């Protein structure tokens, strides 16, 4: 088969991520969906779209959504870009050659921050699962995983090798000793979430849910447990929403610091922090009226040391920001907003006055976007493309360059079409208005106010183009002719129900209209004849398509399935269930019975109309695919979605016993090696110090598991099971029994792991010598005789030491119970009433017996 693929994607400038700024104002790296694009603020031309080397839609593209980019981060000097995606992976690229250097999957959910540290070679990454991982770049390895937060890492701040400090989407800020990787000090920052973190070395600043911004003093050289990071006071903002990024600078040329808190909505609150001279010369002024009350006033600091500044607003909702500074009169701040647009503002400040009632944007890159989701896409014969938006941004892109060359202002526009000669656009809006535009001249040929009483929903030209059909939610369809280049309403068909799709056949034959009442009706255009009524879809029914032979129609709806109908008798053929949310649009190919359907769950799907298979399952969008349009000839198809994207699609095993034996042999070899080393040390310290042994290096596996040999043998002796322990001890020969006795003799000098394994040592040792008693008492060596005596003394001392406190506790606890009894048990002198009282007050337990 001649399958499909993706040629190019565009329409996005700023997506659901952050932005990094690079100096030459300068350029900007930001996110498109799953690929990063670089822009020069000066002009705004797309100078780079760094993308994955595999086209989404190819043979090896995997069966899921692609990983949306979610955090840009840049190493300036050594020229790297660490970008991180929504599945958790981190790709590190060199910006010179634009290839992938490092892949750093690691995480389990989407990631929220990156940071290079010690400028090169180290990258720390925080994610929507609460881990935060340190990575080395010279080893390609996750070094450390700091794991104690609970919800989602909202920010952190590190210095090199000793201290990190993170704050997460619970209420908690944490300080991490990066030598031990244990959390040192934990506070509750804000009572809900904690969304911000910034610090200029003395003061730390955090923000939470609503306007309460908290100043902290971190004293890194502190020694107390609670008090490495203390809280110094709160203050307020003007926004009652989530401040979610704070960032600082030190402008030179005096020395000064500025920080911003961007908000959820539309607003960045900028702040100047002042200097120690005006701290000292402002302290007395609030210390006026002359001291317990004045000390309470001086303690209740934030408004003192912090100074608000020019509160920069924007038109849309703010997603990310970053700035640069010179002279303290060029706080030059780039800002990517949600409705895709970047904006380069710059506030001046004459070091006392900010010299403006409201700041000024110096650049704005917004030409290659829409600011809303494209509710309708269209195409020329083959050359141009039509994108229809809610703000009014009709845009005429071109296929061969992916640049909008022509754009207008219409309104809440949901459907549009071209006109068959090209260079002319019809469009209908969500109120009762229709509009006409062109390509060479300006916007409005004419608008028709009161084109319909209510929301228009779908229009269609005839194949010659002179006559178009508009169906609207005022329960009417209308017909319009082109009189000479103006619209002529002549007839109108009022239905009982809100018509929401129209279509004609591609040979002027049928008019199929989709009603809100779960059905479609097929009419004859030449008679308004009411040929057919196709029924049985069971929810209101979206896009129709008529085939090129005018024999076969498709019918999409919100029932998550498309139905194929034969138009000769109105008989159904398939009812194939696609698309688990809602099929928004469905379109045939030009010459074939193959078709495409794009749906509300971020997927387009390629089907055939003969076997009714799914030919292909294309997976490049991220959100609700609102429209798609096929070429008139040739058959390449464009699809446009809710993530502001427009994309083209073209054609192409030991056991117990022997484990204990090998553990015993290496353990006792290490043990008597160290004992020979100690005898060598005593002889070369008691004799002429001219020589000694060189070095016994400790065993590989013993230093690899970090265990003394007694502990190594002790845990493998633990790890054999009780059912095969009497076999594990019976398999081993008498030489291993003798070195087992050496092992027990050494282990009851370390009285820590003697007392934690007393019954195990007793059981194993007594079975060993009880089984090997005949040979043991025939061995003739005073070393083993002294060994047995030493083991006997230390073992029996440990056992009598534990049963001493056992017997003590028995007699003490029964004394306690008995003195409680003789204090207040009861008063019976008569033995029969006494025994009946004790029988009524006894402990009962009921048992299931068999008779």
């Amino acid at each position: 088969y001649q399958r499909f693929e993706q040629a190019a994607a565009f329409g996005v400038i700023a997506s659901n991520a952050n932005c990094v700024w690079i100096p030459a104002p300068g350029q900007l790296i930001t996110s498109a969906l799953e690929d990063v694009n670089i822009w020069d603020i000066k002009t705004g031309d797309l100078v780079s779209k760094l993308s994955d080397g595999l086209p989404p839609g190819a043979s090896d593209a995997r069966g899921a959504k692609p990983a949306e980019c979610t955090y840009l981060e840049a190493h300036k000097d050594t020229d790297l870009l660490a970008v991180g995606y929504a599945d958790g992976v981190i790709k590190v690229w060199d910006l010179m050659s634009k290839t992938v250097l490092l892949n750093f999957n690691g995480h389990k959910a989407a990631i929220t921050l990156l940071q290079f540290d010690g400028t090169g070679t180290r990258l720390i990454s925080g994610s929507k699962d609460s881990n935060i991982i340190v990575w080395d770049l010279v080893g390609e390895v996750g070094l450390y995983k700091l794991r104690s937060h609970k919800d989602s890492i909202t920010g952190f701040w590190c210095q090199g090798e000793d201290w990190l400090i993170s704050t997460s989407k619970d209420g908690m800020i944490k300080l991490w000793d990066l030598k031990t990787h244990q959390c040192i000090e934990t506070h509750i920052a804000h009572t809900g979430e904690c969304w911000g973190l910034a610090v200029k070395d003395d003061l730390l600043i955090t923000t939470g849910t609503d306007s309460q911004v908290k100043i902290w003093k971190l004293d890194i050289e502190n020694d107390k447990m609670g008090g490495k990071l203390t809280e110094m006071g709160i203050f307020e903002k003007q926004s009652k929403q989530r401040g979610l990024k704070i960032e600082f600078i030190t402008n030179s040329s005096d020395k000064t610091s500025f920080f911003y808190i961007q908000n959820a909505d539309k607003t960045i609150e900028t702040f100047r922090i002042r200097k120690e001279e005006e701290i000292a010369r402002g302290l007395k002024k609030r210390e006026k009226r002359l001291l317990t009350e004045e000390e309470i006033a001086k303690s209740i600091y934030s408004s003192f040391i912090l100074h608000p500044f020019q509160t920069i607003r924007s038109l849309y909702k703010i997603k990310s920001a970053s700035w640069t500074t010179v002279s303290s009169s060029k706080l030059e701040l780039v800002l990517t907003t949600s409705s895709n647009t970047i904006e380069y503002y710059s506030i001046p400040y004459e070091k006392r006055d900010p010299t403006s009632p409201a700041p000024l944007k110096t650049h704005t890159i917004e030409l290659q976007g829409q600011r809303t989701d494209v509710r309708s896409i269209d195409i020329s014969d083959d050359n141009k493309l039509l994108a229809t938006a809610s703000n009014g941004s009709l845009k005429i892109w071109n296929i061969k360059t992916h640049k909008c060359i022509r754009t207008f202002e219409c309104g809440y526009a949901l459907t549009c079409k071209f006109l068959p000669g090209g260079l002319l656009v019809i469009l209908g809006t969500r109120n009762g208005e229709l509009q006409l535009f062109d390509l060479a001249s300006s916007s409005l040929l004419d608008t028709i106010e009161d084109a319909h009483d209510a929301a228009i929903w779908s229009l269609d030209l005839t194949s010659d183009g002179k006559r178009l059909v508009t169906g609207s939610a005022d329960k009417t369809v209308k017909f319009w002719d082109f009189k000479v280049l103006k619209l002529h309403h002549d007839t109108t068909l009022e239905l009982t129900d809100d018509i929401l799709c129209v279509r004609v056949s591609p040979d002027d034959r049928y008019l199929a209209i989709s009603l809100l009442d779960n059905t479609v009706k097929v009419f004859f255009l030449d008679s308004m004849k009411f040929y057919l009524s196709l029924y049985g879809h069971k929810l209101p029914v979206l896009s129709i398509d008529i085939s090129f032979d005018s024999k076969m129609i498709i019918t999409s709806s919100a029932d998550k399935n498309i139905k194929i109908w034969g138009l000769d008798f109105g008989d159904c053929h398939k009812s194939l269930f696609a698309h688990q949310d809602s099929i928004m649009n469905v379109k045939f190919l030009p010459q074939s019975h193959n078709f495409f359907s794009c749906s509300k769950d971020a997927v387009v799907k390629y089907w055939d109309g003969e076997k009714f298979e799914c030919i292909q399952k294309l997976y490049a969008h991220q959100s609700e695919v609102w429209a798609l349009a096929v070429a008139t000839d040739g058959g390449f198809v464009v699809s446009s979605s809710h993530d502001h994207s427009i994309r083209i699609w073209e054609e192409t095993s030991l056991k117990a016993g022997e484990r204990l034996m090998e553990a015993l042999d290496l353990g006792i070899a290490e043990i008597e090696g160290l004992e020979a080393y100690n005898r060598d040390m005593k002889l070369w310290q008691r004799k002429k110090l001219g020589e000694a042994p060189i070095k016994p290096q400790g065993n590989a596996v013993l230093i690899a598991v970090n265990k003394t040999p007694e502990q190594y043998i002790m845990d493998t002796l633990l790890r054999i099971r009780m059912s095969q322990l009497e076999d594990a001890l019976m398999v081993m020969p008498f030489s291993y029994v003798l070195k087992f006795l050496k092992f027990i003799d050494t282990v009851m000098q370390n009285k820590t792991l003697l007392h934690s394994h007393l019954p195990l040592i007793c059981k194993n040792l007594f079975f060993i010598i009880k089984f090997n008693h005949k040979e043991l008492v025939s061995q003739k060596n005073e070393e083993l005789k002294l060994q047995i005596n030493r083991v006997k003394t230390e073992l029996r001392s440990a056992l009598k030491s534990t049963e001493d406190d056992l017997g003590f506790n028995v007699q003490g606890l029964k004394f306690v119970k008995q003195q409680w009894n003789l204090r207040h048990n009861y008063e019976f002198v008569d033995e029969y009433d006494q025994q009946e009282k004790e029988s009524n007050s006894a402990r009962k337990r009921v048992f299931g017996t068999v008779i």
Binding site: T180, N750, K770, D805, N809, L813, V816, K817
Partner: protein, 141 residues
Amino acid sequence: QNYMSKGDWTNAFLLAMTLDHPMRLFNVLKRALGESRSRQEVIFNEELDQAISILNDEQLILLMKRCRDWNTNAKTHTIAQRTIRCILMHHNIAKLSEIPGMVKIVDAIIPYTQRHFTRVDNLVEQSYILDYALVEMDKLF
């Protein structure tokens, strides 16, 4: 958490008792007991058993409930016996009896201590095969 990491078992013990973290309490008592066997009237270190000596009624009733359900093992029973012993030798016996609830605990853990006394006494009994093997090894010449 910082005390349990860096060592320091007495203030770790009283924080585990205040927070009522029972597995951490067993760990701080087991670690302090093991290092008490290591180093060298007093059974824990002196600061920790003074910290046991100065806790009040509801704290020692939850401590003895912890000792009660640790004593049902034959493994975790030594820690329970050392804690019961230091409570017994650092508190007042009339106070311990007249605390409301301290008979439904000590009657629960008298028979378990008797079971362990029987088991460890039989271990001492069958520990004399070493003595028999030594008298044979000395008869060998």
